[PDB]
């Protein structure tokens, strides 16, 4: 009787079985529709990307919120039938949602699961809350940076405090994009989507967050200590210097991207400040980093330094950056749905048939 765990990210969908330490499938959150309409009706994930030249590629969860439900149903259908090789009518399904998800969207997720997929039971959990659970905490603040969105989520005993949730439309996608722009200074010309994929790999392997940006910039200007080599697929070898820490610097200095937003450190502080003074000690002492974009070496120390400069002088600040933080949302879901104490929390079909989609509000 295995529960399913589905983490629908702005960039990658992570799916698998509750009780497992890792998702069985990780695939891009893209739907491909034929341009000519004359052979399959739609393509999802890796297959959609491999046929990009003949399909209209769709990103239905671009910034964490679903903008197209049909595209969403297609992603879910592909997850069950192609990726996990399951019949959704045989399993309780745990779905993840973005923080501050509109009430109408939570209802659509619920309706689609019971009506389109005939799930015997389901549940909708906030991604950030699942990340906190993965680290064995029920109170704390999560900095979740993924592909198309970053959120700072204060949590008190499992409840995400909505008035205190902040969102930045700045994450991995923007950093990869910035890196392509700054790599032109080296005569490099990364423009094609396949070249965008190479740059994302350079970002994931050689980028890091400087403890002191100003100092780091001086070091790279004064020496060749920070220069790193990278071998391209063709066989050609390129060098990357200050671009290694300049691209992730945009998380702390959104003006580098031409954005007026406050950096990730100030956003975390603004979220703590929106909460009652009595729990701030619990927030500062439990700062949980989540998502692929928080994977940068040096990010935890930089957050510790930045937060220390903003926090009351007497405040103990603790940054928790697990090495598996790229999949912590999924891991938290796996823990949650496989817990004995969670079994009475599921929304059953019986309950749904009696109440309609509105049941998600009272239950999730």
């Amino acid at each position: 009787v295995q529960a399913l765990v589905i983490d629908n990210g702005s960039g990658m969908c992570k799916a698998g079985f509750a009780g497992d330490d890792a998702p069985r499938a990780v695939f891009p959150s893209i739907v491909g529709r034929p341009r000519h309409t004359g052979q399959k009706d739609s393509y999802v994930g890796d297959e959609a990307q491999s046929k990009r030249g003949i399909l209209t590629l769709k990103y239905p969860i671009e910034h964490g919120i679903v903008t197209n439900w049909d595209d969403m149903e297609k992603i879910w259908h592909h997850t069950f039938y192609n990726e996990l090789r399951v019949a959704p009518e045989e399993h309780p399904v745990l779905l993840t949602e973005a923080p501050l998800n509109p009430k109408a969207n939570r209802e659509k997720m619920t309706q689609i699961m019971f009506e389109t997929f005939n799930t015997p039971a389901m549940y909708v959990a906030i991604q950030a809350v699942l990340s906190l659970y993965a680290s064995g905490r029920t109170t704390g603040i999560v900095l979740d940076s993924g592909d198309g969105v970053t959120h700072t989520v204060p949590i008190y005993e499992g409840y995400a405090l909505p008035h205190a949730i902040l969102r930045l439309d700045l994450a991995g996608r923007d950093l990869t994009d910035y890196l392509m722009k700054i790599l032109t200074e080296r005569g490099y010309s990364f423009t094609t989507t396949a070249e965008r994929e190479i740059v994302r790999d350079i970002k994931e392997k050689l980028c890091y967050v400087a403890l002191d940006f100003e100092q780091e910039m001086h070091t790279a200007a004064s020496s060749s200590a920070l220069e790193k080599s990278y071998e391209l697929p063709d066989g050609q070898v390129i060098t990357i210097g200050n671009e290694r820490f300049r691209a992730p610097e945009a998380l702390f200095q959104p003006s580098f991207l031409g954005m007026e937003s406050a950096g990730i450190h100030e956003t975390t502080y603004n979220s703590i400040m929106k909460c009652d003074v009595d729990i701030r000690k619990d927030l500062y002492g439990n700062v949980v980093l989540s998502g692929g974009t928080t994977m940068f070496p040096g990010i935890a120390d930089r957050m510790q330094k930045e937060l220390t400069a903003l926090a009351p002088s007497t405040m103990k600040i603790k940054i928790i950056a697990p090495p598996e933080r790229k999949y912590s949302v999924w891991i938290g879901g796996s823990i949650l749905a496989s817990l004995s104490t969670f079994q009475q929390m599921w929304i059953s079909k019986e309950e749904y048939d009696e109440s309609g989609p509105s049941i998600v509000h009272r239950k999730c």
């Binding site: 009780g19 330490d21 659970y133 029920t138 796996s334 496989s338 004995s340 009475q344």
Partner: peptide
């Protein structure tokens, strides 16, 4: 006690997950 309090407590305890 409260079903939610028992859940919270089991989450804090943590658990082993099956290696895949």
């Amino acid at each position: 006690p409260s079903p939610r309090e028992q859940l919270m407590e089991s989450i804090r305890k943590g658990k082993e997950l099956k290696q895949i």
